[PDB]
Design a protein around this ligand. Structure first.
Ligand SMILES: *[C@@H]1O[C@H](CO)[C@@H](O)[C@H](O)[C@H]1NC(C)=O
Ligand SMILES: *[C@@H]1O[C@H](CO)[C@@H](O)[C@H](O)[C@H]1NC(C)=O
Ligand SMILES: *[C@@H]1O[C@H](CO)[C@@H](O)[C@H](O)[C@H]1NC(C)=O
Ligand SMILES: *[C@@H]1O[C@H](CO)[C@@H](O)[C@H](O)[C@H]1NC(C)=O
Ligand SMILES: *[C@@H]1O[C@H](CO)[C@@H](O)[C@H](O)[C@H]1NC(C)=O
Ligand SMILES: *[C@@H]1O[C@H](CO)[C@@H](O)[C@H](O)[C@H]1NC(C)=O
Ligand SMILES: *[C@@H]1O[C@H](CO)[C@@H](O)[C@H](O)[C@H]1NC(C)=O
Ligand SMILES: *[C@@H]1O[C@H](CO)[C@@H](O)[C@H](O)[C@H]1NC(C)=O
Ligand SMILES: *[C@@H]1O[C@H](CO)[C@@H](O)[C@H](O)[C@H]1NC(C)=O
Ligand SMILES: *[C@@H]1O[C@H](CO)[C@@H](O)[C@H](O)[C@H]1NC(C)=O
Lengths: 33, 135, 135, 177, 135
């Protein structure tokens, strides 16, 4: 999990590193189908 | 106990509570199984405390030395008690006078006990030589 | 023998330069067969990988929309350490074999950490002797 | 076992469950395990199959642990078991998609006849229960026919086919002139 | 042992090696006979480690306390071994299973031994009082 830790360190790095102009991210909150 | 030390009980918990939380502090720490350009100075001040903790820690955790149980966490001495000092038995003792309000009852024998304790340590040294005077 | 496609980042050589990446099809270097010879052919000559702007994230699912690029004059070199592959396998196959692709970082940075295994110390150790106390 | 069905022209939905609810690695793979659709971390490996051109999935849902798989414009060959192997189990949908049509194309007359053809995929034992605007419950198997076709038979015919516990409705359009 | 601590042996060296490097660590440390404006922060981070070394050092080097040999480096307990635990004799023991691969063989008795050990400590306390009940 040291590898996961490096992973999350990198994901932490990338976003103040890289600036998405308009990020269209998705979401849902549980409502069963 | 509010700090790295005082770690053998909780305040208000009377004696027996803290006395037994001794061993569970042991058993609980046994297995182990933003940052500003001037956060420097807070870390710094954060440092001392921990050192001083160990320092005092030893400093008399050390001088449990002349008391014959340095290093450890639990003495049992070898002195005859003076009922004039507290005149209480373990039952109410450990369950009452949540220590902070316990030792004030004996705020004066504070050094008489150190007296008698180091005294019995020297007593042991004397008997060791008495016993060794032949073989 | 098969670069099916889909989301560009698993198939195409996708790599970070100018903050952005270079996206071509399955035309280059992806082809050769091996029975005791390769199958391609034969300075900076050519291969056509171009840039996009609306990328996907390796991080958390969902799109992203980056900026128009710089006028030009860019360059990136490298030193490939290795490659990322899985058999394009199945059960339709008869004696030809094909490998085929990678987009999960948790190995993308694990061709560099097979060594690193973090451990605590367990410096308390147990062993046998013939050691026992006075009764 | 959990089937789905299609209509030779529709789409369909196929389900994948996950308890961590976390977008962990799933792959969609047919009977003898070609790769069809696969979560590679935060990505979808359009596998090397017959379905390098069609299949898909609602992408957002993954960060919920529900991974879908659709087969758009089903033709009878996309009819095959699938599999989803999210963490330690391999949920199998089974899709047996067909379609149907009638013989007559544009021209019919009153008192004539018409027949049916249902393009089942192999291994199916369905039963075609078929309807009419006039209540002609054509009770039988595949090839449904009637020796009476009239002006009153105008209007489409709600035809249906039972393939292992399900059916799906059908036009049989009837137009005169 | 890769750090200020773990200082009683070398990895891969099986038990006897480390057990004896104990005394030579003793005997080897007995006699004693560019700097950037932000080197600050490295020194800083360098600090913790050493403290924490002593801190953990004690922290159970301390709680060898209830184990009856705090402070020191070498216990001998007073418990009856369970051949069900390892069933090995010093010969192969010390010369094999280079400890890291030794204790995994007993990765479960980890706390049963602490059990029996503190238990025999309380056993000693009980016998001390039995013996003192007359004189
Ligand atoms: C303190 O009072 C509470 C009453 O809610 C009691 O349960 C608790 O035992 C008391 N503390 C001690 C040390 O007895
Ligand atoms: C303490 O007790 C001993 C014997 O029990 C006695 O000789 C001594 O005078 C006592 N001292 C005090 C201060 O009570
Ligand atoms: C002091 O100790 C004696 C011992 O016999 C006991 O009877 C008495 O109640 C105690 N008195 C006080 C005030 O504690
Ligand atoms: C502690 O004191 C309370 C009253 O002050 C009493 O009810 C209780 O019995 C005492 N503790 C013991 C162990 O007797
Ligand atoms: C016990 O300590 C208090 C502390 O204020 C002191 O006043 C008192 O005199 C001491 N006891 C005796 C017997 O002197
Ligand atoms: C480990 O193997 C080497 C051989 O390369 C040997 O010299 C050494 O004695 C072995 N380790 C121990 C602790 O004996
Ligand atoms: C350990 O040994 C003692 C006697 O030698 C025995 O009574 C006990 O059951 C043993 N326990 C285990 C877990 O082997
Ligand atoms: C267990 O101990 C017995 C004691 O005599 C011995 O004979 C046997 O070889 C040992 N077995 C193992 C697996 O250590
Ligand atoms: C340790 O194991 C090796 C191989 O199993 C053997 O050669 C060696 O003699 C063993 N150690 C002892 C002390 O027997
Ligand atoms: C000994 O420890 C192992 C560690 O994996 C554990 O699986 C096993 O259950 C333990 N022994 C017994 C008898 O339970």
């Amino acid at each position: 999990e040291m590898v996961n830790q490096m992973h999350e360190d990198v994901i932490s790095l990338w976003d103040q590193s890289l600036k998405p102009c308009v990020k269209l991210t998705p979401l849902c909150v549980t409502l069963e189908c | 106990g509010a700090v790295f030390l005082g770690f053998l009980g909780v305040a208000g918990s009377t004696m027996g509570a803290a006395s037994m939380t001794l061993t569970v502090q042991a058993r609980q720490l046994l297995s182990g199984i933003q940052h500003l350009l001037q956060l420097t100075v807070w870390g710094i001040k954060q440092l001392q405390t921990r050192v001083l903790a160990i320092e005092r820690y030893l400093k008399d955790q050390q001088l449990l030395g002349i008391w014959g149980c340095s290093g450890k966490l639990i003495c049992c001495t070898a002195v005859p008690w003076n009922s004039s000092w507290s005149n209480k038995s373990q039952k109410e003792i450990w369950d009452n006078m949540t220590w902070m309000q316990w030792d004030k009852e004996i705020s004066n024998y504070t050094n008489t006990i150190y007296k008698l304790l180091e005294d019995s340590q020297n007593q042991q040294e004397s008997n060791e030589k008495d016993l060794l005077a032949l073989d | 023998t098969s670069s099916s496609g889909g989301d560009l980042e698993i198939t195409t050589h996708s790599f970070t330069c100018r903050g952005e990446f270079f996206y071509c099809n399955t035309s280059g270097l992806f082809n050769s067969t091996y029975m005791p010879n390769g199958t391609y052919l034969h300075s900076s000559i050519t291969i056509p990988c171009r840039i996009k702007q609306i990328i996907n994230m390796w991080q958390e699912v969902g799109r992203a929309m980056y900026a128009p690029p710089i006028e030009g004059n860019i360059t990136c070199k490298s030193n490939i350490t290795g490659l990322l592959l899985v058999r394009d396998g199945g059960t339709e196959s008869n004696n030809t074999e094909t490998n085929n692709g990678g987009g999960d970082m948790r190995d993308n940075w694990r061709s560099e950490l097979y060594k690193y295994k973090v451990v605590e110390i367990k410096p308390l150790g147990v062993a046998p002797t013939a050691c026992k106390r006075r009764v | 076992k959990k089937v789905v069905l299609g209509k030779k022209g529709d789409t369909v939905e196929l389900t994948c469950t996950a308890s961590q609810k976390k977008s962990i690695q799933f792959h969609w793979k047919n009977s003898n395990q070609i790769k069809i659709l696969g979560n590679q971390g935060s990505f979808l490996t359009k596998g090397p199959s017959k379905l390098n051109d069609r299949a898909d999935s609602r992408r957002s849902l993954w960060d919920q642990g529900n991974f879908p798989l659709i087969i758009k414009n089903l033709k009878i060959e996309d009819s095959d078991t699938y599999i989803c192997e999210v963490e330690d189990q391999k949920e199998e949908v089974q899709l047996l998609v067909f379609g149907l049509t009638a013989n007559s194309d544009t021209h019919l007359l009153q008192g004539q006849s018409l027949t049916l053809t249902l393009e089942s995929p192999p291994g199916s034992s369905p039963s075609v229960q078929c309807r009419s605007p006039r209540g002609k419950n054509i009770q039988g198997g595949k090839t449904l026919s009637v020796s009476q076709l009239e002006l009153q038979d105008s209007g489409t015919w709600t035809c249906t086919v039972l393939q292992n516990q399900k059916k799906v409705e059908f036009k049989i359009d009837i137009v005169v002139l």
